[PDB]
Ligand binder design. Structure first.
Ligand SMILES: Nc1ncnc2c1ncn2[C@@H]1O[C@H](COP(=O)(O)OP(=O)(O)OP(=O)(O)O)[C@@H](O)[C@H]1O
Ligand SMILES: Nc1ncnc2c1ncn2[C@@H]1O[C@H](COP(=O)(O)OP(=O)(O)O)[C@@H](O)[C@H]1O
Ligand SMILES: Nc1ncnc2c1ncn2[C@@H]1O[C@H](COP(=O)(O)OP(=O)(O)O)[C@@H](O)[C@H]1O
Ligand SMILES: [Mg+2]
Lengths: 136, 238, 144, 240, 199, 253, 184, 397
């Protein structure tokens, strides 16, 4: 019954979005983390015309994120940190900056710099493998 | 929850029972009933046919076969299983007649067939053998140095000397009826009449020529099955 | 009617549930004594004070519902088969203490106060008891 | 199901057991009772033969393996018969190679070793047959009780099978007399123990009992209805 | 285990209404042995079936009604309204009570008696009639006592709930009460209560 | 929720150390909470007790309830594995509250129970959180009887939760002897019986095995032909017991 | 808001996410509020498409939590604490910053931490003469918090076995021995 | 009690080629209908009969008042007071007026009550709420046993169950076998279960009640069991009667521990249906017929021998039954001489009666496509795979 009801909800969503009685000036927006698991009936034009991908920031985008989140930051090499190849999202950049500020608060200095900013950077993107070497 | 133990012959019930072999025992009742009676003058076997089509050739259904001229067989259970058991019985009889140039006791016949049985849970099945209990109950009759002898063989390998034993679909009722019918002073003719009467009151259909197969063993003659005229003769009196 | 609220002649109120309607804590009418009113009996009450005006026992009659509707069942010991051990056990249960109380008394053992008859439906259970109910010289009671 | 630990002999219980072994132990209880006694010079095995129907002979429970050693079964016909065949082959080989009868202790130890392998290794079922071994050797008569747990015990007497506790307590009560009886008194004692196993309505008739006797100069011979007949003449009446 | 079941819903409609509460004009009594209760001016005995005594013994105890008075005689019965008048009647004694029990406006005329003679003329149910009887009404101690002789003593006391109405002078009101219509079992009775004042 | 389980300790037998431990675990702290507050310590709230299924873990619980004459709750572990979610969502909470208002009370949770697989998690979590979530003075105690000591959640067997520990061993011959002589106290049994012989003949027979042997000796004396309760029915009872059914199976040698 | 995750999963299909919504709506209504979601591994146990109904409902609850936590409606003055024993099975979306910006390894007590535990929990108990933390620390390696407190508890219970009104060094020694044995 | 219902007109259906034998018979029927119309219009034209008692009836009506509410007499007390439940569900201890028929008062029968101060003022023997009135068949379905192809064993069984007790039943009590109370037809969809029910309702002599199973379930609390009780009470009242409950699995599914209120109400409704099935003796002349496709999903208490003895199987039609159905449905078609219809039947498939009817309809449509009405064999050839939509080829050979 549960799966049947969930699929009933999905079917009602489909029939409401692009069913018999068409809607006028009703734009729907839906966000997902795993698009490949969505029903193909929801992923077709007329229902979801544009499937916009939001990839992890790439270099330039990373610089824009760092700049626009550091506007409220203190004065403080952000360019090198951007240059570092790390698969990190805008959430990670916001983290890094927030953690840098938090550490500066801990150390009681109102302008972050290489030391605490770098420490926050390490803290955020841990990615510590703890992986048994026989896998590699 | 019995279900965890009926899977496999090598499992012990909390009561220490062998559920697989009990199911093999119940598999006999799927077969037709076979009645063997033992008397001083000999041993007689009566078996039903349970014919399915009138076109079925009577010879093809073999509810009684002869291991040797002196010994007769009845089976109830899986026909291919019964044929393997019977071929092994004839082979072991020929083996004894090779080694000792003598005809064995029917007790020895059931002994050797039993060693063929109860081998399901044996490591000797590496080249290939039964991995499951045998699915036929057996009835041996014959005449040996101990006079007439009748034995009943269980698929688990159990053998018992019987004055009269009924196995198969109607084992319980036929055995209960014989319990009161049987007298140790039974003559061969009256024994065969009683067996046919038991069949009549046990059979599903009317007794005609093509429903009953009949075999006799006496110390004088060999194993003898009743031919069409012979079974007609034994059926006209009843 | 529901819990008596431990009246003791000074708190005679009871809370009563009028069906799918609400429940109210009310008192008695002068025409009924508290001895006639107890938890779980149907009571007819007025509509504004909701005073319990008259207890309404649901009455007993085989005409309504189904009941024992039997005093001497027509099923005898010859009408039962396949439960010889079971009918023997039932005999020890019912016939021995009822029709032979002396053996239980002088044996100094309490006669079996309770017995349960479990089995798959259609085994015959009911009529088996009914059978002994004819031969126990006692009336049979059927309650579903 | 919190009983997934009893499906094979290769899994230990959470509290440290093999419940399959205990199941095999309980298995032999379904068999008929059988009591073994030994004198100063003779050993006797008295078994209650049980027949499937009164229209048939009773099941034998006294298998002879060697002129000095006899065995009595309680449990699976298949396992008991395999054990008996292996006994017969082992005694045959021992006489062929050594020309001396098989020692009872070595025979019983070989039983333990043979039946331990199914208990330890996956595959063949554990041998679920309780065996009573009455043998004769240099130390006189020996009574051995081999349990389906691949274990064996040396007992003065032993009752294994259905309702064996009655005979067990009977032999405990009559402990004080066993070592000084001759053939007649010990045979009567074993018959009385079997009677203790048997309920009141049944008695130890000719077709009901099977007796095997072995000794220093008398080979292990099993008696039948006509042969058991003298040994049941000295039997007394049931104390009811 | 992986149940995760939905749920339906079956409502139950519920409602009621208190009707216009119905005034039951019922009298109760235990004069000799029976807790007789009668509803009523048609009379019908509710409980206490065919009376061991005659009806007349209780016919004199029967608000909302008052005797007819001329303009000369002050009508204490009338001006005591709207509340009405409560009386004590001595025959056996009778009192009228107004109660609010349940959903019925109870105008009890509760009866009670004692000293029933074992062969008194009140229990053999013999009855000829009630001859017209004159009650002399006068004030003794601020209470309107009516002394009437019973012909077939009565010491009626009338008190108004409005304890401000002036007491009329001692007059002689003639009551003529007779059992107009009834049955032999005396379960369907019609009563007459005609009475006029006379100075 | 029975108030009088009707025991005087004269009904149960063979648990002398167990009953002593139980008394000093529940009623002695209850009776002497003042001496506990003198120690500057919290009296045990939880007493975990364990043993086989035939050792009468409830007859001792009822004996304790009767001795302390307090209210007696009773909850079942195998009752809770089914009925999905709600196991402590509205049951353990309500049961504990029922104990709270109806003081003095002796809450009882019997049977081991496992202490998919996520409902039992919330069962034990509510158990622990509301056994801790109660008045520190501990007016109401809880007896927890389990069938085994193999599954042990550290949060539940930890201190405060289940401090005291009671073990139920294999009942011995004297325990049997006393238990059938107690169970036959309402019997007009002649002294000719040998309760010691029966006790030594009741190997493996723990507790509940009496109920079988003792009361079936009763109804066999009934079956004997109304004979006096001598040995003549009792040894038949010990022979019958749980093995009274005869399988009567062929293919057995 | 002391909330344990295992207590909010329900068979009723839409009730767990509804409960999460009610929790966070209460938190928004009653600022300042602290949401302590214990045993969060019972909710945020990674999202996978095996398709069994139960784990699917778990994913629905997890994503309701994710929305209520860092969703469209920004959060003000509401801080959450999520404790678990299996951090590695948490969903990466929940593990991401913005929602759980810090991951604090409240690990097993060290030797200094252990002795601190004993000395702090030793307060209420009355000591007669001498009690040393160091020996108990050496003899109680692998202990974590509550078990150490257990050592104290039955110690007072030990004090009733020989009927004292105090505690002794042998009392504590055998208490920690029994605690360690029960821990095996 | 009263008598049965479901009046039907002439079978006609003796000619179909529209050869004026049809016209003559239909004109006779129309003439009789005209005499119906004229006779009743004349009788209403002159029929002066009224008043008479008047005054007593007028005063009893004044006593009853207006409006009068109907309730269910749940229980009776001493013969002046009773317990009556309004349609809402509230029941009251009310008084019984003199002019009511004390013999008619029984638990269940609808009672006319006073709007104010409720009191039993009448008895209504024909309550028959609109739903249960709908479930009662008025116009017999035009299908009949002639239209049913094959299922000869099934027809035999259904007639032996519901017709033989209705007609001469002396064989039943002569053998002493109780008549089969209730029969369940089952099988794959479109085998002819509902068609057989229609044919039974055609050749009938008893009140036929058609039910949907899912129709019984009602939103309001206790409405479900009350409606089931009303249905079976109507069945007994108009006995002999046949109660056909199509798609019994709408409620007949396995009973499980209910959790929500709605599932508890469904369990209550099925419990009431089972109780009503047990309530009347099998010797009674009321039978039930329940049809379903998913027989395996039914509660194994509804199909107990003590409740529903028989179990009629509706297997997929055999080749001879297939050709019978083809002949039946092709009777009204103007088939040519080239058609054989044997190839379609010989094709090993799982055609059903519904499938064959659809094949005939589609063959007619294909013929209409070619502007013809003689319907070649090629039309059937195309139609067969047109309507039969959807073992790996040479695996089995
Ligand atoms: N034996 C038959 N002979 C002729 N027509 C048949 C036959 N069986 C079925 N049909 C046709 O099938 C159509 C549908 O059959 P029906 O309504 O009885 O289905 P059913 O088998 O009860 O299935 P379901 O209950 O699943 O809807 C009928 O209108 C009829 O024309
Ligand atoms: N021992 C028996 N003797 C006679 N009839 C039996 C017996 N057992 C079952 N039956 C038959 O089974 C039918 C149903 O038995 P019933 O008592 O209703 O089953 P249950 O025990 O489930 O109530 C009866 O009509 C009866 O004819
Ligand atoms: N000392 C005793 N006194 C009385 N009854 C006992 C005693 N020991 C065991 N029992 C029996 O044990 C049974 C209860 O078993 P119980 O211990 O509750 O099982 P479990 O531990 O599985 O829940 C009762 O039938 C009871 O008679
Ligand atoms: Mg249909």
């Amino acid at each position: 019954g549960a799966d049947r009801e969930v699929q009933r909800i999905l079917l009602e969503l489909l029939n409401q979005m692009d069913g018999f009685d068409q809607n006028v000036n009703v734009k729907v927006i839906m966000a997902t983390n795993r698009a490949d698991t969505l029903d193909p009936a929801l992923l077709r034009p007329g229902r979801l015309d544009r499937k916009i991908e939001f990839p992890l920031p790439d270099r330039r985008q990373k610089r824009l994120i760092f700049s626009t989140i550091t506007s409220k930051m203190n004065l403080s090499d952000l360019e090198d940190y951007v240059a570092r190849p790390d698969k990190i999202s805008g959430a990670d950049i916001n983290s890094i900056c927030q953690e840098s500020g938090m550490l500066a608060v801990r150390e009681n200095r109102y302008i972050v710099l290489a030391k605490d900013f770098e420490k926050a950077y390490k803290t955020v993107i841990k990615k510590d493998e703890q992986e048994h070497e026989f896998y590699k | 929850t019995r279900s965890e133990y009926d899977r496999g012959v090598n499992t012990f019930s909390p009561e220490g029972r062998l559920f697989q072999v009990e199911y093999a025992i119940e598999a006999i009742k799927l077969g037709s009933t076979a009645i063997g009676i033992q008397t001083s003058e000999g041993v007689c076997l009566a078996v039903e046919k349970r014919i399915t089509s009138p076109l079925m050739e009577p010879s093809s259904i073999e509810k009684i076969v002869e291991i040797d001229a002196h010994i007769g067989c009845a089976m109830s259970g899986l026909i291919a299983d019964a044929k393997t058991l019977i071929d092994k019985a004839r082979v072991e009889t020929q083996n004894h007649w090779f080694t000792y140039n003598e005809t064995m006791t029917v007790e020895s016949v059931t002994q050797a067939v039993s060693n063929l049985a109860l081998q399901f849970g044996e490591e000797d099945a590496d080249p290939g053998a039964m991995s499951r209990p045998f699915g036929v109950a057996l009835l041996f009759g014959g005449v040996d140095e101990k006079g007439p002898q009748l034995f009943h063989m269980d698929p688990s390998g159990t053998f018992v000397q019987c004055d009269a034993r009924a196995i198969g679909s109607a084992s319980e009722g036929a055995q209960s009826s014989l319990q009161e019918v049987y007298h140790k002073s039974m003559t061969l003719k009256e024994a065969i009449k009683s067996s046919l009467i038991i069949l009549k009151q046990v059979m599903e259909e009317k007794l005609n020529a093509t429903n009953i197969e009949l075999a006799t063993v006496q110390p004088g003659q060999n194993f003898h099955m009743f031919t069409k005229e012979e079974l007609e003769e034994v059926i006209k009196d009843i | 009617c529901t819990k008596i609220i431990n009246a003791d002649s000074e708190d005679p109120k009871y809370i009563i549930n009028v069906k799918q309607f609400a429940k109210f804590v009310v008192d008695l009418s002068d025409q009924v004594a508290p001895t006639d009113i107890e938890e779980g009996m149907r009571v007819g009450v007025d509509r504004n004070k909701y005073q319990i005006h008259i207890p309404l026992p649901p009455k007993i009659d085989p005409t309504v519902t189904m009941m024992q509707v039997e005093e001497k069942p027509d099923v005898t010991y010859s009408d039962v088969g396949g439960c010889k051990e079971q009918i023997e056990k039932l005999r020890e249960v019912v016939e021995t203490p009822l029709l032979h109380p002396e053996r239980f008394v002088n044996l100094g053992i309490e006669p079996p106060k309770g017995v349960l008859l479990f089995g798959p439906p259609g085994t015959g259970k009911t009529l088996c008891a009914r059978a002994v109910a004819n031969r126990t010289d006692a009336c049979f009671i059927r309650v579903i | 199901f919190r009983n997934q630990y009893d499906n094979d002999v290769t899994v230990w219980s959470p509290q440290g057991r093999i419940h399959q072994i205990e199941y095999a132990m309980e298995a032999v209880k379904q068999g008929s009772a059988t009591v073994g006694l030994k004198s100063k010079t003779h050993a006797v095995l008295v078994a209650l033969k049980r027949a499937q129907s009164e229209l048939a002979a009773h099941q034998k429970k006294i298998l002879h393996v060697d002129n000095h050693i006899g065995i009595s079964i309680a449990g699976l016909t298949a396992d008991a018969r395999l054990l008996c065949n292996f006994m017969r082959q082992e005694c045959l080989d021992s006489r062929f190679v050594f020309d001396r009868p098989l020692p009872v202790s070595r025979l019983v130890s070989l039983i333990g070793s043979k039946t331990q392998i199914p208990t330890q290794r996956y595959g063949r079922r554990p041998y679920g047959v309780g065996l009573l071994i009455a043998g004769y050797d240099d130390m006189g008569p020996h009574i051995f009780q081999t349990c389906p747990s691949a274990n064996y015990f040396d007992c003065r007497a032993m009752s294994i099978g259905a309702r064996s506790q009655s005979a067990r307590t009977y032999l405990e009560r009559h402990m004080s007399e066993f070592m000084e009886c001759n053939l007649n008194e010990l045979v009567k004692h074993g018959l009385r123990a079997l009677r203790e196993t048997l309920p009141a309505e049944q008695d130890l008739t000719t077709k009901n009992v099977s007796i095997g006797i072995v000794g220093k100069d008398l080979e292990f011979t099993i008696y039948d209805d006509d042969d058991v007949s003298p040994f049941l003449e000295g039997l007394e009446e049931r104390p009811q | 285990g992986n149940l995760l079941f939905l749920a339906c819903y079956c409502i139950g409609g519920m409602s009621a209404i208190k009707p216009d509460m119905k005034i039951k004009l019922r009298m109760e009594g235990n004069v000799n042995g029976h807790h007789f209760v009668i509803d009523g001016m048609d009379l019908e005995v509710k409980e206490g079936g065919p009376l061991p005594f005659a009806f007349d013994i209780l016919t004199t105890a029967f608000n909302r009604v008052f005797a007819k008075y001329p303009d000369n005689i002050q009508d204490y019965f009338k001006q005591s309204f709207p509340k009405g008048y409560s009386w004590e009647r001595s025959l056996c004694n009778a009192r009228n009570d107004i109660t609010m029990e349940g959903d019925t406006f109870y105008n009890k005329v509760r009866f009670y008696g004692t000293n029933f003679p074992a062969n008194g003329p009140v229990m053999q149910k013999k009855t000829l009639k009630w001859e017209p009887s004159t009650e002399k009404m006068y004030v003794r101690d601020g209470v309107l006592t009516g002394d009437i002789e019973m012909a077939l003593d009565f010491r009626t006391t009338y008190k108004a709930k409005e304890k401000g109405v002036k007491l009329p002078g001692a007059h002689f009101v003639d009551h003529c009460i007779e059992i107009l219509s009834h049955d032999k079992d005396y379960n369907k009775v019609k009563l007459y209560e005609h009475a006029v004042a006379h100075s | 929720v029975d108030e009088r389980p009707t025991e005087q300790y004269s009904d149960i037998g063979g648990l002398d150390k167990q009953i002593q431990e139980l008394v000093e675990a529940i009623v002695l702290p209850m009776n002497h909470k003042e001496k506990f507050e003198n120690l500057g310590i919290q009296p045990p709230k939880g007493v975990l007790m364990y043993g086989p299924p035939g050792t009468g873990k409830t007859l001792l619980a009822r004996a304790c309830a009767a001795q302390t004459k307090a209210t007696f709750l009773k909850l079942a572990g195998p009752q809770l594995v089914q009925m999905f979610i709600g196991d402590g969502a509205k049951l353990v909470r309500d049961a504990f509250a029922l104990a709270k208002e109806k003081a003095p009370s002796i809450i009882f949770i019997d049977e081991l129970d496992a202490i998919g697989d996520r409902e039992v998690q919330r069962t034990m979590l509510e158990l622990l959180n509301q056994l801790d979530g109660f008045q520190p003075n501990t007016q109401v105690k809880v007896i927890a009887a389990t069938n085994r000591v193999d599954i042990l959640d550290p949060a539940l067997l930890r201190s405060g939760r289940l401090d005291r520990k009671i073990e139920f061993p294999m009942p011995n011959e004297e325990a049997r002897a006393r238990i059938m002589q107690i169970h036959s106290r309402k019997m007009n049994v002649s002294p000719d019986v040998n309760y010691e012989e029966l006790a030594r003949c009741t190997d493996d027979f723990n507790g509940a095995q009496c109920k079988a042997v003792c009361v079936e000796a009763g109804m066999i004396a009934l079956r004997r032909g109304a004979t006096e309760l001598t040995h003549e029915d009792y040894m038949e009872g010990i022979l019958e017991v749980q093995a009274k059914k005869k399988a009567n199976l062929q293919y057995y040698a | 808001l002391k909330v344990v995750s295992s207590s909010i999963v329900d068979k009723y299909i839409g009730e767990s996410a509804r409960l999460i919504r009610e929790m966070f709506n209460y938190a928004r209504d009653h600022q300042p509020c602290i949401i302590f979601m214990d045993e969060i591994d019972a909710i945020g146990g990674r999202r996978f498409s095996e398709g069994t109904s139960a784990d699917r409902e778990i994913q629905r609850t997890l994503m309701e939590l994710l929305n209520q936590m860092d969703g469209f409606d920004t959060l003000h003055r509401v801080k959450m604490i999520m404790a678990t024993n299996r951090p590695d099975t948490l969903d990466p979306a929940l593990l991401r910053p913005g929602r759980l910006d810090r991951k604090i390894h409240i690990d097993l007590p060290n030797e200094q931490a252990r002795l601190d535990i004993l000395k702090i929990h030793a307060g209420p108990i009355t000591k007669h003469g001498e009690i040393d933390y160091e020996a108990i620390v050496k003899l109680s390696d692998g202990f974590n918090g509550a078990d150490l407190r257990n050592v104290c508890t039955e110690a007072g219970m030990f004090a009733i076995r020989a009927d004292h009104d105090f505690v002794v060094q042998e009392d504590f020694m055998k208490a920690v021995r029994k605690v360690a044995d029960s821990k095996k | 009690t009263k008598g049965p219902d479901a009046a039907s007109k002439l079978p006609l259906v003796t000619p179909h080629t529209q050869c004026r034998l049809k016209l003559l018979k239909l004109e006779r029927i129309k003439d009789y209908l005209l005499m119906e119309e004229e006779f009743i219009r004349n009788q209403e034209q002159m029929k002066p009969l009224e008043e008479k008692q008047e005054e007593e009836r007028s005063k009893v009506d004044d006593l009853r008042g207006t409006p009068m509410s109907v309730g269910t007499l749940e229980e009776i007390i001493d013969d002046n007071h009773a317990i009556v439940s309004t349609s809402v569900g509230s029941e009251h201890y009310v008084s019984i007026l003199s002019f009511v028929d004390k013999d008619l008062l029984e638990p269940g029968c609808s009672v006319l009550l006073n709007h104010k101060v409720h009191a039993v003022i009448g008895v209504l023997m024909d309550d028959t709420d609109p739903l249960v009135t709908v479930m009662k068949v008025e116009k017999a379905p035009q299908e009949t046993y002639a239209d049913i192809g094959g299922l000869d064993n099934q027809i035999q069984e259904i007639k032996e169950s519901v017709e033989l007790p209705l007609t001469h039943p002396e064989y039943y009590e002569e053998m002493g076998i109780k008549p089969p109370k209730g029969v369940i037809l089952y099988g794959p969809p479109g085998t002819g279960k509902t068609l057989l029910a229609k044919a039974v309702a055609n050749q009938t002599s008893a009140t036929f009640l058609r039910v949907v199973g899912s129709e019984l379930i009602q939103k309001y609390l206790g409405d479900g069991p009350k409606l089931v009780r009303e249905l079976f009470r109507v069945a007994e009242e108009h006995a002999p009667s046949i109660v056909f409950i199509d798609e019994i699995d709408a409620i007949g599914t396995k009973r499980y521990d209910s959790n929500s209120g709605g599932e508890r109400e469904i369990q209550r409704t099925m419990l009431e249906l089972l109780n009503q099935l047990d309530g009347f003796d099998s010797r009674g002349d009321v039978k039930v017929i329940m049809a379903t496709n998913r027989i395996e999903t039914l509660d194994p208490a509804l199909i107990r021998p003590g409740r529903i003895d028989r179990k009629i199987e509706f297997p997929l039609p055999d080749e001879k039954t297939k050709k019978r159905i083809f002949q039946i449905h092709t009777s009204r078609m103007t088939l040519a001489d080239d058609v054989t219809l044997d190839d379609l039947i010989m094709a090993k498939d799982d055609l059903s009666g519904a499938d064959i009817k659809a094949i005939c309809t589609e063959a007619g449509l294909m013929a209409l496509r070619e502007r013809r009405m003689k319907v070649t064999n090629e039309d059937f050839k195309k139609s067969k795979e047109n309507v039969l939509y959807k073992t790996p080829e040479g695996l089995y050979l």
